């Protein structure tokens, strides 16, 4: 029934609940079934990054195209490994093997963020070359 | 140096990193020291909710002011208990007691969300009375 369009009480209660839920999801480890969507999000954000990079390559010196092309390939690879460990981890849910598969998951994810940051670094250095820094 | 104002590569890499970090914070349990800010957020959102409710009471039948006033008092109370268990949990960080104190934390937090939802319910029922539902 009720219209919540400018129902601040309803808004502020949704906010308090959301905050209790971020707090609890962060204190707690997630049920393997609840991390497919999370890995899905990671996948999207990477797919978007790679598209953007694809459209930046042409404006940067050819002298650099390959180093960047390699940094891209490695990111796709890391998502490879991360999807792997994720499936293994769903497989062993509730067993004595579940823990070691979360850890190989975090390691794969962490490697992806480190290699994404390295991608920024190669691309900024190519940007600094076209712009002509001393 | 570089201006990131419309640097989409930098934007998309921050996004991929943020997503890896939400995924990892959610798979993993948080270091007791990292949940003060989280409980702080919960506190703010509740303080805002209670302010909004304070400003809605006068427009709803006096016949209901007290039930709502009690639901407010209980929310403040639950934040009471939640801050307690949080401090206890920081206290016992790395000990054999740390776990049981996270659980009493999640229980307190969860009780707060349930009692916040009940606050919406009392207030919607008071709204349905002023508006004149059949």
């Amino acid at each position: 029934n009720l219209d919540r369009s400018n129902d601040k009480v309803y808004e502020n209660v949704t906010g308090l609940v959301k905050a209790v839920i971020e707090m609890s999801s962060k204190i707690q480890p997630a049920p393997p079934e609840e991390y497919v969507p999370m890995v899905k999000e990671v996948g999207l954000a990477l797919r978007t990054l790679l598209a953007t990079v694809d459209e930046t390559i042409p404006l940067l010196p050819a002298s650099t195209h390959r180093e960047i092309e390699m940094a891209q390939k490695l990111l796709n690879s890391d998502l490879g490994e991360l999807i792997n460990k994720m499936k293994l981890a769903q497989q062993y849910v509730m067993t004595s093997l579940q823990q070691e598969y979360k850890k190989q998951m975090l390691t794969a994810a962490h490697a992806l963020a480190v290699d994404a940051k390295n991608l920024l670094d190669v691309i900024d250095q190519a940007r600094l070359k076209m712009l002509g820094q001393t | 140096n570089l201006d990131r104002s419309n640097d989409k590569v930098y934007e998309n890499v921050t996004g991929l990193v943020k997503a890896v970090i939400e995924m990892s914070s959610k798979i993993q349990p948080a270091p007791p020291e990292e949940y003060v800010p989280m409980v702080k957020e919960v506190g703010l959102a509740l303080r805002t909710l209670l302010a909004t409710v304070d400003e809605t009471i006068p427009l709803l039948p006096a016949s209901t002011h007290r039930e709502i006033e009690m639901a407010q008092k209980l929310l403040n109370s639950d934040l009471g208990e939640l801050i307690n268990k949080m401090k206890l949990a920081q206290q016992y960080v790395m000990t054999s007691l740390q776990q049981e104190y996270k659980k009493q934390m999640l229980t307190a937090a969860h009780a707060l969300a349930v009692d916040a939802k009940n606050l919406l319910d009392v207030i919607d029922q008071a709204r349905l009375k002023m508006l004149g539902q059949t």
Binding site: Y10, T14, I21, S24 | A113, V114, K117, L120
Partner: peptide, 12 residues
């Protein structure tokens, strides 16, 4: 309250 209940149901 259907979206708020997606949330209330998230705490089980």
């Amino acid at each position: 309250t259907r979206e708020l209940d997606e949330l209330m149901a998230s705490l089980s």
